[PDB]
From Swiss-Prot, chain A:
Protein name: DNA damage checkpoint protein LCD1
Subunit structure: Forms a complex with MEC1.
Shown chain mapped onto the complete sequence: 322 to 747 of 747
Processing and modification events after translation: Phosphorylated by MEC1 in a cell cycle dependent manner and in response to DNA damage.
Naturally occurring in which organism (per UniProt): Saccharomyces cerevisiae (strain ATCC 204508 / S288c) (Baker's yeast)
Compartments reported by the entry: Cytoplasm; Nucleus
Its biological purpose: Forms a complex with the serine/threonine kinase MEC1 which activates checkpoint signaling upon genotoxic stresses. The MEC1-LCD1 complex is recruited by the single-strand-binding protein complex RPA to DNA lesions in order to initiate the DNA repair by homologous recombination, after the MRX-complex and TEL1 are displaced. Required for the recruitment of MEC1 to DNA lesions, the activation of CHK1 and RAD53 kinases and phosphorylation of RAD9 in response to DNA damage. Required for cell growth and meiotic recombination.
GO MF entry, a single one: damaged DNA binding
Record carries keyword Coiled coil: yes
UniProtKB/Swiss-Prot annotation, chain B:
Function noted in UniProt: Serine/threonine protein kinase which activates checkpoint signaling upon genotoxic stresses such as ionizing radiation (IR), ultraviolet light (UV), or DNA replication stalling, thereby acting as a DNA damage sensor. Recognizes the substrate consensus sequence [ST]-Q. Recruited in complex with protein LCD1 by the single-strand-binding protein complex RPA to DNA lesions in order to initiate the DNA repair by homologous recombination, after the MRX-complex and TEL1 are displaced. Phosphorylates LCD1 and RPA2, a subunit of RPA, involved in DNA replication, repair and recombination.
GO biological process: chromatin organization; DNA damage checkpoint signaling; DNA recombination; DNA repair; DNA replication; nucleobase-containing compound metabolic process; positive regulation of DNA-templated DNA replication; reciprocal meiotic recombination
Similarity comment text for this entry: Belongs to the PI3/PI4-kinase family. ATM subfamily.
Subcellular localization, as worded in the UniProt entry: Nucleus
Domain FAT, chain residue ranges per copy: 761-1099
Principal subcellular localisation of the protein: nucleus
GO molecular function: ATP binding; protein kinase activity; protein serine kinase activity; protein serine/threonine kinase activity
Quaternary structure note: Interacts with LCD1, which is required for localization MEC1 to the RPA complex. Interacts directly with the RPA subunits RFA1 and RFA2.
Protein name stated in the entry: Serine/threonine-protein kinase MEC1
Length: 422, 1099
């Protein structure tokens, strides 16, 4: 079934290969039909979702039997369809990007949790990985902006989730399912036919809620968590040095960490979106993708590639070590006045969780809500970009301060320490 | 993020303030600035190089003072830019080597040699001396202004120690080079606040101009006294003004070279200092020398306005220019930026709107002579956009506005403005016409004189035909303006028709007609192309050609025009044949010295290698260029014109093709390659005709039509030239036209040129073109030259009737059918459908149409129905309705659907129109150019029944786009008779948008009266009258308003009394019977007139 869905997608060669920009003389005098486009969008989306489903039911088998699935043909076919999905020069369909990185996650997850790990790794050529990881980098350096998720804008920089493919799909419910009413309106429902019922393309789109943009940000932030999660996995696959655990996980991940801190501090604090926390989880996650790269894999972190990011690595670590001062929180009384400013949405979330959806949140015994006025406070600290968690302060400390490599000299280091105190 | 809120001046100043604290020797500031610069770069979607490259000529400029100490700072700058230290240095060598030299003698030039070449083993002496020779012009400039080195021994000595291998003292006599003057005047920094230093350096470059141009060979050494300003006597000021005008067009050539940088060599800092040099030459120069080269700075400031970051400095340069110049000379260039003001007004921030207000108030107070009565379009354009708000500013200007609108006839100055080239003025003219005609409809008195509206209609048709493959939007609004004009009466409205004229016949062998052709080609096309150019390279090439042609005409080198010579009566009477709008722009460049050969990269290509697959405009330019450089040899006066056709849009190549090809014709006794390359082009014509024509979509076949037309033109020009050559040979050289057997040998080669790739194939490759009169000409020529008594009249006729049945002529078609074509009886049947018994042929075709043997005998029935307005019978045909729906993808069925859509548009019935486009939208890829128009009109009508105004506006605008690109063709070639079939569809597209845009009956009644006013310019032919009234009928019975029904009864009564006056009471009755369900009290007389025209008298 996996081989059939892979060459089924290479039959549907042209859905994932529409060009970036059309002709200036591309006259939009046309029947403006959507029904055939809706058919093969459903074909491609359900096909990639079936690839994800085949690999998780193969993931659920007992761990001695994975060699009955994999051969050369599986990996060459998925290499083709993975180059097809995470596109470069064509318009990206985001529906297939989710499943096409979730498949890579299932692969790197079972490589870890099997016994005959070599005969997968011997079956995988390094060219497969160094074609995969560059596309994962190029996915990771894209932007997530709610005001132009659903807008059509400049390519390969904003994960945009186009208007003309906005439905759920098989595994996960990814949009608002605006094109689900048109699935039932694709047939005549009192007739036995072959050609589709005609759907006009320009009727859709009617403007009432940007909340749809917020939950699509939530899915795209989970997508970036997924990408650097499989970075975290294939660090652990190739613990020894290879072609692919090769120092650009300092460059791209440190670019990502530095910018998702910088425009967090410049733009997101006090914007009362629900997607702050996960967005300040990504930085909180990707430091660890720095950290064990720094601690356990320094032998490939080459001397030139560290100087490619000497700005951004040191600045990103410094925005964690700035939080050891902590004259901001220091009490209880004004921190809840901060979470009335930045984190009212999670107050609504925890009240609806407490009164409806959690067994332990009733008849609160004066130790379970002292835990709440501990953890909401450390949460709103982690949102306010001052006072992160202490463990991440240590992990950022033992890269900057520790003497594995001269990031700073001692007369350059105390020039950073004086900008906190110290 | 303080910088992110700024614009060009403040933005570059703040980027400099970013980088001088980037290198503020604290580690924390350096790492934080690297991070913020890189994030600021990536949130602008720019690499940090192209973020900081507009200030790298300023940033590391002072690093040339201190490069040996601040190696770590330049190291930080190169690791921030992400390039190598050499690659940013040879591209910015222009800016620091003029300061690396002139500083103290223990130079950084050894270190810049150490970077600019790798290692000591790469020899630094020759690379040092040729980088010194590379940008020596800027070094000379910096030596003259920034330090005042006005002594040649100072320059020579300070060169020869910095480079002991430097050539011949300095690179000799290169100081009065145009490039040195350009680099002098680029350093004119200026501001709104005139400083003592800003006057100091201005006086310094003015005195360096006085050093370089007026007495150079006298004062190569005695130059230390020229640094003083006020020791300049007035007796040598006119020598300065004389040497300046002979040394100013080439420095604008250097300016034109380094604005329009075709290789991406520099940023816009060069463009800024070019505009500063333009501003200096506006201020500190004589008045004549800017009136001289005005059309240089015109398309310099045009590219300055066009690029985004240099807009404000270019507006300030115009603001300088607009006040230092009178009114009768500013008319040449004012439209090209009034249009840019109006069409790009929206993105102007506060500062640009302030400087453009400062343009306009200066223009309306001090210089109202240009705006009010020298060209009145410029005030109505500014009043026509109330977003800008002219009238609230002055008020006294409105006293001139509210009378200058009335007293100025405005159509013929829309005429010559629509033949422009830049897109801004032909968006402004279209946005002004679509307001002007909207005012003239409700004014109800737009003129129709038996200053004609057909001038602007032909201008619009030429405009839409020019841009059939460029910018669909202005073809949309162009076709919308055509629809606002509507259909003209074919009798009392006619185009220009300038062929009974001088007729473009010019013998290029005698001088006395060669000079007349050159003055005509300068007057009509070269002088307009000299102004309306897009890049300045084309404007310089036009300047070169229009100089060298005058040098051929004996007017350039000898100087006579000042009226102190006066001994040239022949030359003055020759000069008089120009007109003043060409004289005032051709007068400066008599004494110009343009020299733009660009030789020895030409590769004369063998001919039958076709260039069709690239396009038409590539093909005709390459073919014309392969002609005129292989048959001319530098003294035949068409030689310089090759510089025009490496940047042509295809127009000028198409103009010159008959002349150079006819000159290649008249070379004899084969011998030379001149006839051999003739054998190159004949087979090239064989490459044109004997081609594929399938396997390509509707773009490459249109290019093939253009390739047809471009070489039909040379055939009719060879014929016209040979006939006039016989005529003026027998006219003046004696009377009896036979002599010498060599001019006859000239005349034989057109005869084997007009009989190569011969007829039956000119006609075949011309009736598909749609120039049907030309195809009729070739069909008759291949009738007579054929011995017609034999049986070749079977294959000749089945397309001969095609070349009459849409040409508008009938009485020869009916004469062709009843002579030598009397075999088949079906041929005798088809004569009925043009001779008043057409319905006798209709029901014969209907039962021939139920044989199901051929597809074309069905579309013959459908076209014979459509030509006789049987629309309800077309939509009820069983050839479409199998049971309810229709058949699949369409080889010839689309020609059926093109009818079946169109009649469904003309019979307003929402169900048979709605299931019809339900069947259309089941298709896959509608390739057909004709189907999609009537499809979009159909979906516009379905939306107009659903009471949805913006949706039907969207679909009618789609219909305007499709007509303005595809269906519309060139004017001034075709008639109005063949254009009328499209004008009726445009007049039926405008009134749907005009009736849909109405929210109440109060304006709907006014809309109906405006349309009934539009039913008076229509004329009195039955086909467009019935078509437009049928479309109002189809509107009024999809919109179920009661006022729409009261309109609908009126439209049925007007259809009835229309049709009974046109002897077509077959549909007058079945339109009048709709007025009885409405029960009008006027149908009792209308049925009496229908009974009277029927024949029965007593009833």
């Amino acid at each position: 079934c996996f081989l059939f869905i892979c060459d089924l997608i290479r039959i549907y060669h042209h859905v994932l290969k529409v060009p970036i920009h059309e002709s200036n003389m591309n006259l939009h005098v046309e029947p403006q039909i959507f029904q055939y486009e809706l058919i093969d969008y459903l074909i491609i989306s359900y096909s990639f979702d079936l690839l994800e489903g085949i690999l998780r039911v193969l993931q659920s088998h007992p761990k001695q039997t994975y060699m009955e699935f994999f051969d050369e043909n599986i990996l060459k076919s998925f290499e083709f369809v993975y180059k097809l999905a995470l596109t470069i020069s064509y318009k990206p369909m985001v529906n297939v990007i989710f499943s096409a990185v979730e498949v890579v996650n299932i692969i790197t997850s079972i490589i870890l949790n099997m016994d005959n790990s070599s005969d997968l790794k011997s079956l995988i050529s390094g060219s497969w990985w160094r074609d995969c990881i560059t596309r994962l980098y190029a996915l990771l350096e894209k932007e997530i902006k709610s005001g132009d998720v659903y807008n059509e804008n400049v390519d390969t920089t904003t994960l945009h989730m186009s208007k003309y493919h906005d439905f759920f799909g098989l595994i996960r419910n990814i949009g608002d399912n605006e094109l689900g009413g048109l699935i039932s309106k694709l047939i005549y429902t009192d007739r036995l036919q072959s050609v589709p019922r005609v759907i006009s393309k320009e009727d859709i789109g009617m403007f009432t809620a940007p909340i749809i943009g917020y939950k699509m940000e939530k899915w795209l932030l989970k997508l970036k968590d997924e990408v650097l999660n499989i970075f975290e996995n294939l660090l652990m696959i190739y613990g020894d040095d290879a072609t692919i655990v090769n120092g650009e996980m300092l460059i791209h991940s440190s670019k990502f960490l530095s910018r998702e801190q910088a425009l967090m501090i410049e733009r997101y604090v006090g914007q009362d979106s629900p997607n702050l926390d996960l967005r300040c989880h990504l930085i909180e996650h990707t430091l660890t993708i720095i950290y064990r790269l720094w601690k356990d894999h320094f032998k490939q972190l080459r001397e030139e590639q560290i100087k490619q990011v000497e700005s951004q690595l040191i600045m990103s670590l410094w925005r964690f070590l700035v939080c050891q001062t902590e004259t901001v929180t220091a009490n209880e009384r004004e921190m809840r006045d901060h979470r009335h400013l930045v984190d009212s949405l999670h107050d609504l979330t925890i009240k609806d969780q407490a009164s409806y959806y959690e067994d332990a949140f009733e008849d609160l015994p004066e130790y379970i809500e002292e835990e709440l006025k501990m953890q909401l406070n450390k949460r709103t600290g982690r949102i306010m970009q001052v006072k992160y968690d202490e463990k991440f302060q240590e992990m950022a400390r033992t890269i900057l301060e520790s003497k594995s490599f001269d990031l700073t000299t001692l007369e350059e280091a105390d020039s950073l320490y004086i900008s906190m105190g110290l | 993020q303080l910088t992110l809120t700024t614009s060009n001046d403040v933005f570059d100043t703040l980027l400099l303030k970013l980088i001088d604290i980037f290198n503020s020797d604290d580690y924390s500031l350096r790492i934080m600035m690297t991070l913020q610069i890189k994030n600021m770069a990536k949130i602008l979607k720019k690499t940090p190089y192209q973020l900081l490259s507009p200030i790298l000529p300023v940033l590391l400029r002072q690093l040339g003072k201190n490069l040996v100490e601040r190696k770590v700072g330049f190291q930080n700058l190169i690791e921030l830019l992400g390039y190598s230290s050499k690659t940013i240095l040879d591209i910015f060598q222009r800016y620091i080597i003029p300061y690396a030299i002139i500083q103290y003698k223990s130079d950084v030039l050894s270190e810049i040699a150490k970077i600019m070449c790798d290692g000591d083993t790469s020899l630094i002496n020759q690379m040092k001396v040729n980088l010194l020779k590379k940008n020596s012009r800027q070094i000379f400039a910096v030596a003259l202004v920034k330090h005042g080195l006005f002594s040649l021994d100072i320059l020579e000595t300070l060169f020869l120690n910095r480079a002991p291998t430097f050539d011949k003292g300095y690179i000799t006599a290169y100081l009065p080079d145009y490039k040195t003057l350009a680099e002098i005047t680029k350093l004119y920094k200026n501001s709104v606040t005139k400083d003592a230093s800003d006057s100091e350096n201005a006086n310094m470059i003015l005195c360096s101009l006085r050093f370089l141009i007026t007495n150079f060979e006298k004062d190569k050494r005695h130059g230390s006294k020229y640094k003083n300003i006020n020791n300049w006597t007035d007796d040598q000021e006119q020598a300065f003004q004389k040497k300046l005008q002979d040394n100013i067009l080439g420095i604008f050539q250097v300016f034109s070279s380094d604005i329009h940088d075709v290789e991406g060599r520099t940023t816009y800092y060069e463009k800024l200092r070019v505009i500063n040099g333009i501003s200096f030459l506006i201020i500190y120069a004589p008045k004549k020398s800017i009136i001289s080269a005005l059309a240089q700075i015109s398309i310099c400031l045009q590219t300055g306005l066009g690029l985004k970051e240099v807009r404000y400095e270019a507006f300030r340069c115009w603001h300088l220019l607009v006040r230092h110049l009178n009114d009768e000379e500013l008319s040449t260039v004012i439209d090209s930026l009034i249009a840019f003001i109006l069409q790009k007004w929206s993105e102007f921030n506060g500062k640009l709107r302030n400087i453009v207000y400062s343009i306009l108030d200066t223009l309306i107070k001090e210089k109202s002579d240009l705006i009010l009565k020298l060209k009145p379009y410029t005030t109505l354009a500014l009043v026509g956009k109330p977003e800008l708000g002219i009238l609230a500013r002055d008020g006294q200007f409105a006293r001139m506005v509210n009378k200058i609108r009335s007293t100025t006839d405005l159509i013929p100055i829309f005429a010559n403005n629509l033949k422009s080239s830049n897109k801004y003025v032909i968006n402004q003219n279209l946005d002004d016409i679509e307001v002007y005609l909207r005012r003239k409809q409700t004014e109800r008195s737009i003129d129709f004189t038996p200053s004609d509206i057909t001038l602007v209609l032909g201008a619009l048709l030429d405009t839409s035909h020019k841009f059939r493959n460029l910018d669909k939007d202005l073809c949309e609004k162009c076709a919308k303006c055509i629809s606002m004009i509507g259909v003209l009466d074919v009798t009392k409205h006619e185009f220009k028709r300038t062929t009974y004229s001088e007729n473009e016949v010019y013998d290029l062998n005698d001088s006395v007609q060669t000079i007349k052709f050159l003055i005509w080609v300068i007057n009509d096309i070269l002088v307009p192309a000299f102004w309306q150019s897009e890049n300045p390279s084309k404007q310089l090439f036009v300047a070169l050609v229009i100089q060298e042609s005058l040098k051929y005409c004996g007017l350039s080198s000898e100087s006579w025009d000042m009226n102190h010579k006066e001994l040239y009566p022949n030359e003055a009477k020759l000069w008089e044949k120009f007109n003043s709008v060409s004289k005032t722009t051709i007068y400066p460049l008599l004494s110009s010295l343009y020299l733009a050969q660009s030789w020895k990269e030409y590769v004369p290509l063998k001919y039958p290698s076709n260039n069709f697959k690239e396009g038409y405009k590539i093909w005709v330019k390459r073919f014309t260029l392969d002609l005129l450089k292989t048959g001319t040899t530098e003294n035949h006066p068409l030689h310089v014109f090759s510089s025009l056709i490496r940047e042509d849009d295809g127009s000028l190549s198409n103009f010159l093709l008959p002349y150079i090809s006819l000159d290649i014709i008249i070379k004899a006794e084969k011998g030379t390659p001149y006839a051999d390359i003739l054998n190159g082009i004949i087979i090239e014509f064989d490459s044109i005709f004997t081609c594929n024509l399938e396997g390509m979509n509707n773009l490459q076949v249109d290019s093939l039509r253009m390739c047809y037309e471009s070489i039909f033109r040379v055939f009719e020009y060879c014929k016209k030239w040979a006939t006039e050559f016989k005529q003026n040979y027998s006219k003046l050289h004696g009377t009896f036209i036979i002599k010498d057997t060599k001019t006859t040998n000239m005349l034989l080669r057109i005869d084997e040129f007009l009989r190569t790739t011969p007829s039956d194939l000119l006609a075949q490759r011309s009736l598909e073109t749609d120039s049907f009169e030309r195809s009729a000409l070739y069909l008759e020529q291949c009738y007579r030259q054929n011995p017609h008594d034999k049986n070749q009249n079977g294959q000749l006729l089945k397309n001969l009737q095609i070349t009459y049945e849409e040409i508008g002529d009938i009485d020869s078609l009916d004469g062709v059918l009843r002579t030598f074509a009397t075999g088949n009886l079906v041929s005798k049947i088809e004569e009925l459908q043009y001779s008043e018994n057409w319905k006798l042929a209709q029901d014969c075709f209907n039962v021939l149409g139920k044989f199901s043997d051929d597809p074309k005998t069905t579309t013959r029935m459908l076209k014979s129905m459509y030509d006789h307005q049987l629309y309800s019978q077309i939509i009820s045909n069983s050839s479409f309705h199998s049971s309810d729906g229709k058949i699949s993808l369409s080889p010839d069925v689309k020609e059926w659907y093109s009818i079946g859509l169109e009649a469904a548009n003309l019979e307003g019935n929402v169900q048979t129109l709605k299931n019809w486009v339900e069947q259309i939208e089941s298709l896959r890829n509608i390739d057909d150019r004709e189907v999609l128009l009537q499809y979009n009109i159909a979906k516009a009508l379905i939306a107009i029944s659903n009471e949805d105004p913006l949706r039907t506006q969207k679909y009618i605008h789609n219909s305007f786009r499709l007509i303005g690109t595809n269906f519309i063709t060139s004017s001034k070639e075709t008639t109005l008779l063949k254009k009328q079939n499209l004008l009726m569809k445009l007049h039926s597209l405008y009134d749907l948008s005009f009736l849909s845009s109405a929210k109440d009956k109060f304006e709907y009644k006014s809309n109906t009266t405006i349309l009934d006013y539009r039913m008076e310019r229509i004329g009195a032919d039955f086909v467009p009258n019935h078509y437009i009234l049928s479309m109002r009928k189809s509107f009024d019975q999809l919109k179920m308003n009661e006022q729409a029904d009261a309109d609908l009864g009126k439209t049925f009564f007007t259809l009835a009394q229309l049709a009974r006056n046109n002897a077509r009471l077959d549909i007058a009755s079945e339109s009048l019977m709709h007025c009885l369900e409405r029960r009008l009290p006027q149908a009792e007389l209308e049925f009496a007139e229908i009974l009277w025209k029927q024949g029965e008298n007593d009833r």
